[PDB]
Amino acid sequence: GWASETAALSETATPQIDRITIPLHELAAMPKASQRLLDDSAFDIETW
Amino acid sequence: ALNSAVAAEGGYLVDPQTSETIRGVLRSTASLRQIASVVNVEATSFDVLVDKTDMGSGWASETAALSETATPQIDRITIPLHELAAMPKASQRLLDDSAFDIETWLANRIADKFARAEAAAFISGDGVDKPTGFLTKTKVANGAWAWGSLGYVATGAAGDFAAVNASDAVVDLVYALGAEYRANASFVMNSKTAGAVRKMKDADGRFLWAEPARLMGYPVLIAEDMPDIAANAYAIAFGDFGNGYTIAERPDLRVLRDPFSAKPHVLFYASKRVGGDVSDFAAIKLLKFAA
Amino acid sequence: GGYLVDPQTSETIRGVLRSTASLRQIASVVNVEATSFDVLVDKTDMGS
Numbered sequence: 001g002w003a004s005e006t007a008a009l010s011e012t013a014t015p016q017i018d019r020i021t022i023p024l025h026e027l028a029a030m031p032k033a034s035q036r037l038l039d040d041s042a043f044d045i046e047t048w
Numbered sequence: 049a050l051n052s053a054v055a056a057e058g059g060y061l062v063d064p065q066t067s068e069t070i071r072g073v074l075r076s077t078a079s080l081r082q083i084a085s086v087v088n089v090e091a092t093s094f095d096v097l098v099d100k101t102d103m104g105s106g107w108a109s110e111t112a113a114l115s116e117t118a119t120p121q122i123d124r125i126t127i128p129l130h131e132l133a134a135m136p137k138a139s140q141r142l143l144d145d146s147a148f149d150i151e152t153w154l155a156n157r158i159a160d161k162f163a164r165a166e167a168a169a170f171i172s173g174d175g176v177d178k179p180t181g182f183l184t185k186t187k188v189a190n191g192a193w194a195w196g197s198l199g200y201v202a203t204g205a206a207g208d209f210a211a212v213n214a215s216d217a218v219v220d221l222v223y224a225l226g227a228e229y230r231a232n233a234s235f236v237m238n239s240k241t242a243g244a245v246r247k248m249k250d251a252d253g254r255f256l257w258a259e260p261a262r263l264m265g266y267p268v269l270i271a272e273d274m275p276d277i278a279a280n281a282y283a284i285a286f287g288d289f290g291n292g293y294t295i296a297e298r299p300d301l302r303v304l305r306d307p308f309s310a311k312p313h314v315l316f317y318a319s320k321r322v323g324g325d326v327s328d329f330a331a332i333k334l335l336k337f338a339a
Numbered sequence: 340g341g342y343l344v345d346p347q348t349s350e351t352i353r354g355v356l357r358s359t360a361s362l363r364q365i366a367s368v369v370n371v372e373a374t375s376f377d378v379l380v381d382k383t384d385m386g387s
Contacts, residue, residue, distance in 0.1 A: 005141055009311045063348060070343065142340040150340070 070148050072157065076272050079167035083234060083269060084293040084324065094127035094296035096327045100195045123195065125327050127296040130177050132162055133319035140307065140314055151305075151316070158318045159301050166322050168273040170295065171236070180325040182293055182332050183274070183282055190224050190333065198326065199224070200334035206279050208244075208337065215248060215256060221286055221335050222264060229288035229331045234267035236285045238274045245284075277337055284335035292331030295324035 003009055038045055050057040087094065104118035136154055143150050171181040182198065190199035201224055203217040204210030210217055225233065237245070242261065250256040261268050266286070275281040303318040326332060369376060 003312055005139070007312065061352070066343075066345060139340060142344075145344050146340060147345050148343050150343075 066147075070153055072160075075160070075164060076167075076270075077160075077163065078270050078272075079163055080170045080236065080269060080271065080289060080293070081163070081167070081295055084170065084289045084295050085291065085327070086295040086297060088299050089127075089129065089296045090298060091129065093129050094294070094323070096125045096127070096294055098123045098125065098328060125294075125325070127179075127294060127323045127325060127327075128175075129296050129321060129323035130179065131319050131321035132166060132178075133317070134158055134161060135315060135317045137310055137313050137315045140312055143314060154316055155301060155303055155318065158303075158316075159320075162301070162320055162322075167271065170293065170324060171271055171273045172275070179295075179323045181273075182285065182289075182326045183334075185326055185329070187282065187334055187336065193330075195329055198329055198332050198334055200282065200336045202339055203335060203337050204339065206338055208277055209248070217335060218245075218284070219264070221284070221333055222266070225287060225333045226330065229291070230266075231288075232290055233286060233288040233331075234269050235263055236269045236271050236274060236289075237283065238272055238276055239270055240276050241274070241283045242268060242270055244277060280336065280338045282334045282336050285332060286335070287332030288328075289332065291328045292326055293324065294327040295322065297322035297324075 001012070033045060052059055052062055099120040100123045101118070101120045103120055106112075106114060106117060108114055136158070138150055138154060166179065169179040169181060172183050173179050173181045174184050186197045187200050188194060188197040190201050193199040201217060201221045204213075209215070222230065242263075245263065246255060246257060248256060257263060261270065274285065275283055277283045298321055301318055301320045303316055306315045306317055307313075309315050
């Protein structure tokens, strides 16, 4: 603030630091493919 | 564009020209420093060494077996060299926007106050944290004069000078001082004592005493810190302060500006340190008004 | 200290700005060192 010609000029204020956390979770998927329908199938399911 | 008197019709184009230097009341400077013994000393104290006595001469015979003669005993006097400090507070917004030189004026106005505050200590100051003036030196009647004391001559009447033979207490004070100290000696009075001296007039109304304002031919230092003519006061002193009084000082003024204590101000802290008391007690006589 | 401040004073005295368009930059300006100027025109034309 404007100090003015005469004043004590006390301590004003300081930005209060706040911390935001990005917990970094994981994204998972487990397609359960049978073994039969994996080698007797003409389509490559393991790459599909 | 018209007359410079009325404001709107061209009166705003004037700008009063201010002073060159910021003047001030010209206060007393007769400080006894210019007549006493000022010695630069960068220490905690000054220790003078005097010879309170003298030797003995023989006038030896042709066959006399010369004996040992006297030898002057020696006195040491310690000038404590106290300090004098003043701390004026000037705003920082002022110092910036103040076309004069406020710092140089503050140091020049302080050095005027110090040269004036130490003039009181050299005359009537006591011993605590300040030089002892020659008035606090156990004044003893003259004739019964010892070394550790200042002599004085009495006037007669208590309130003022003698009732009948006035102006004899002044002349015998002169000739009670020693022909070698009177060579360069001077009275010390205040403004209202030197006035009461000039008002002294003979039996016909004419002044009996005939810019430096000397008295009986000897100079007069018009102090402002000696006592005036009271019931039992020492209003007039006279002596060779060139040898009687010694001043010890550091010939500078240490100013420490402090922008930190008072934050929007600067708070100049200046302090020179000076001390001094009488070193030759035989060289200062006094005029007590008691009896 | 409030007596010895002496504000600055805007080295040149300014004024409100007025328009400079004066019809001189479209009209005909004739330097005439006389009591008056004449012009000679042809209010009509010839015949054929």
